[PDB]
Amino acid sequence: GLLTFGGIGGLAVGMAGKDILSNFFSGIMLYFDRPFSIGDWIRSPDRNIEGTVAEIGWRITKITTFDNRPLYVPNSLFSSISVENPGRMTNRRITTTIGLRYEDAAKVGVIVEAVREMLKNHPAIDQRQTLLVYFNQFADSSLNIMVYCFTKTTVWAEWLAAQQDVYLKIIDIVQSHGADFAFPSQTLYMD
């Protein structure tokens, strides 16, 4: 009897409150080992925890989303998911595709070399990072050329301006020769 209600109930009690003690243990571990600061935004490819950290409590962490809305995340999630910290980034990346008209195949090399030369001389591009311009796709409606480079600023303000300037220069270079980009461009076979 005494054992029947002492050692049996304590098993249900000790197994039904598992999540709360897990949250508190994860909070303690975060206190001892913190992979992020307060004033930086974090990310996770497994769960949606996008936003800037606001407070770190014993049970839950308050995160301010980009909609200016508070988000409360239990601490136990941080012990089982991959946590990404874009706030500690060193450079911002520019990636795009060109997509010529599938008929201007003789201009691919000169366009690629012109784009590479332009990127090599742009003052806003970090020359110590990766810089690739090549035709490597062979799409079903266009000849695609990849662009891969990095900027030296990470403030989300002049990065966009640099990307816009690069895109405009790319358009100008493309239209300097006869490329004029491409569309879906099927055929019809009328009957």
Place this chain on the structure above:
Amino acid sequence: GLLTFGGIGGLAVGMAGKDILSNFFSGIMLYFDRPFSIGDWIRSPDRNIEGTVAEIGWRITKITTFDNRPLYVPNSLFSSISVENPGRMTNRRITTTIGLRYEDAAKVGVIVEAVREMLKNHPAIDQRQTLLVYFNQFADSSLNIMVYCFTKTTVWAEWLAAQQDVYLKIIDIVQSHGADFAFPSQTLYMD
């Protein structure tokens, strides 16, 4: 025999009714640590619990959906999912895409500067928040320009009016020059 029979019965009973005790423990924890009030609506990216909180019981929480239907949520969910509280937001966000006609590439800069100037002078826009207008997509059928700003009201009533006014002003600015937006716009190669 008595000890092992009691242990078996207790183990079966405890692991059979884990969910009920979990719900009650979560309700107690909510009573002690409440991340939301009564008269505010909450959200979660993991489960569908959208609606306004009505009552907070020991076992379940009653939430009034936007269809004016009651929704009963077990308390154990709140200890394992991320809870978002839009009712505590400070600003409302306006985001949209323009998408020019891929042929008016010489007007992109002037259109962007005009839209940015108009947004900077709109009385309904919070000037202390993020404000970005840039061409950063380079889509397959249009040249897309992003818009990102915040309003100073959060009442879902004049926020929509301000969004409509901003959209109409954007249309007027776009058609002031020759842009006229864009459509899918493939090609045919008739045969």
Place this chain on the structure above:
Amino acid sequence: GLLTFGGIGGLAVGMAGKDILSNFFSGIMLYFDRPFSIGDWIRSPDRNIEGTVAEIGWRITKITTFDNRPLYVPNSLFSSISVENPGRMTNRRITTTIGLRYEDAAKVGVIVEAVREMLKNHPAIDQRQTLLVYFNQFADSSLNIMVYCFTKTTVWAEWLAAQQDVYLKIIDIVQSHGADFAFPSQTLYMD
């Protein structure tokens, strides 16, 4: 040997028969705390239990679907999923989108005001609920206007009649000016 043999047997029994005792405990909890009545239909965003409740047993709950087919739901589901009770609703909602032709942008304001005034004077619309008519989308082929209102009846019979009348009045108002709705409406660029 006897003690450990009995413990092994009891542990195996508890492992195998967890679900049945879970169902019975959930049924008991339903008896003590019932979130729904008999003659009302319930819903769940997690599982498919749509239908009207018929009987509530100790193990399973009988639900009559809208195809006039019986559905038997184990009681353990109700302790781990969110349960919605549309049978306790207070109002029925009407939501729709208009989608003008992207060329009649000068009529958007007058159409919106006319629709709002018509909805404000409709005898079947509850004036104490939400009522929003705004242009807030910027779709890829149309200019979309949102409609959001509530009726004062919840009987699925004159709610549909009121919705049909509102839709017909909306069509009449839209065609009073020159809007004539819209289609996908791409472009071709023949060659």
Place this chain on the structure above:
Amino acid sequence: GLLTFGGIGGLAVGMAGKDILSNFFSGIMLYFDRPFSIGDWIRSPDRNIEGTVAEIGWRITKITTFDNRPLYVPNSLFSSISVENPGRMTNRRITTTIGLRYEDAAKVGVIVEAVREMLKNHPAIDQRQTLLVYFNQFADSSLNIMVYCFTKTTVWAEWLAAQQDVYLKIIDIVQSHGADFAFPSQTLYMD
């Protein structure tokens, strides 16, 4: 040493063989509480167990699919999923959509009333069940009218004949006025 060795062996045995005794306990529960008979077909929205029951054993249940192929289902599934019994249905449902041509908007009311009157006078329709004919969709390429009624037979043979007769009468009624249904019907804007 003997006690702990026996405990280890028993725990391993209980952990490994949970599913078999779970199946047997589920079969015993089915024997005591059977939600279906032998000569009726069952369904489940969670798993694929479609078919007609053939035999109910202690471990597995044999179900004859509609391809005349035997299907063996473990008994433990029936204690954790929702089981639907269409073999106990009282009526068969007819549901369809009309989809007018978006230009015959003045005929919607008369078409709806004609269809409703025809359904009310059809000898094969159960007049005590739900009967709704309304225009409630407002689709992107057609004006859709919903049809919702029940038949008094459940034999899968006269139900199909009644459905075909109803569809033919609907076609005749629709073409009596000028509706002629609708197609995707986009626009082109040639250039």
Place this chain on the structure above:
Amino acid sequence: GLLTFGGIGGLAVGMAGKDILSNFFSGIMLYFDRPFSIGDWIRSPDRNIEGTVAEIGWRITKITTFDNRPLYVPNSLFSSISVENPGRMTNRRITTTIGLRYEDAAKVGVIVEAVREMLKNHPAIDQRQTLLVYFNQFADSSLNIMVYCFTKTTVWAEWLAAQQDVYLKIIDIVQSHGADFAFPSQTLYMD
């Protein structure tokens, strides 16, 4: 110390080695209760175990796929998934859809009766099984007629020949009157 150390070691061993002993227990249960033979092919709607059984071991079962490649399946799967045995089928099913031109609505009845009469007199069709031919779909681009019948052979060789003959006869019957099937068949509305 010795007792608790032995208990810890045994708990670790039992938790780590659950799957192997589960596989052997499932193999033993298969030996005692076998739902399939060697020279027949099995199927499962839950997992991909398609193929013909070759050997049944204590731990794994070897199955020869239809690509003439060996497949090894652990025995524990058969105790938790539904197993289908097409090798024990009694008949093979023929199902197809016709899809008329949506303009020949006056020929639907005569076409249906002709197809039904043809199927009723075909020597390769089992007359004691289900036989249904009805117009029951009302598709968006065609008027669809369902066909449902069974053959008296199950050898995958003359079943295909009978299906081909039935399809050719259906084509001949359909083209005897003016139906000529149908295509997507949208509309364009030039501008």
Place this chain on the structure above:
Amino acid sequence: GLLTFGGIGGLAVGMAGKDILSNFFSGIMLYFDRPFSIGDWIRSPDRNIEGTVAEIGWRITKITTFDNRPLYVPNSLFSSISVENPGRMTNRRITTTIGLRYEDAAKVGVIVEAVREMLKNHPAIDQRQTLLVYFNQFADSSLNIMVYCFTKTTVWAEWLAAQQDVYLKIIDIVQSHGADFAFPSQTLYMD
């Protein structure tokens, strides 16, 4: 106190380190019972373990993918997933679809018989395996004919050459009569 403290510590250790000892037990089982050799490539429909086996360790198995990149797979996966061994295959399969023009329905039989006769006389086709050529699809834009045969070689080099030769012969046979294959081929209905 000592006994319960030791039991708690041991239970925590056993619960935390389950995966490592599971991997080692799976490796021991693989050593005792190996379903594959070193120099053959394996496959699994459950997880992505495509590649050729290189080494079999106590904890993990090293597999060389077809990109010439090493892949390390924990041993515990092999005790819970189905493992397919294409390296032990006896024949390679050729499967394809023809898809005539839906207007040449009178040539289906002669085309099928010609293709079957050609396959029956091809020196690279195994005559003791399955060989089926039938019209069994009735697609929405074409009349599809299935092809199913096996080759006597499994070297991935002569198999491709035989497949190419068979495809070219099929094209020649198809164009010998008037078939000319088919395209999507909708209709437009101008307005």
Place this chain on the structure above:
Amino acid sequence: GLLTFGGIGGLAVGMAGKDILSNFFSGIMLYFDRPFSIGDWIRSPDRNIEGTVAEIGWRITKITTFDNRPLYVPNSLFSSISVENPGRMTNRRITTTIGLRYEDAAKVGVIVEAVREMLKNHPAIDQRQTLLVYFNQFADSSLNIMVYCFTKTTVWAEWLAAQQDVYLKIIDIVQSHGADFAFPSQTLYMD
């Protein structure tokens, strides 16, 4: 009382803190048995851990993504997922599809032989690896030819240059005869 209280508390602690001790055990195992080094990038088909390893701690591993952002991965993941190490690759693979115009079927053999001969004599292609050029797809709008080869460099800089050169040579060879690639190319059946 003391014994059962301590047992319940220890069971709760062990059930709550499983993840942290699992992470530390996985870190220790990584220290003893590591499948990767610091200065190489790893991959996993199960989870998103793409990037280059930076630091290996006791609890978490720091990985630098290709966006120059830090990523923190718990150590327990590496004991349950497949880890791929592209940094230890020996060759880089080139794969592409040609897709002729469905009317130039008489040139397939000569085009295939020309492409194979060109690949056989390219100085940047490893002749000891797989090299396949065959027509094996028979697509719905084109006759597709597969290309499969390997390069002798693995530094991502001249690999792209070699791929671009190969693609340009393929284009030149294809246009040497009359192929001119292909488009979707449906038919219209005007009415």
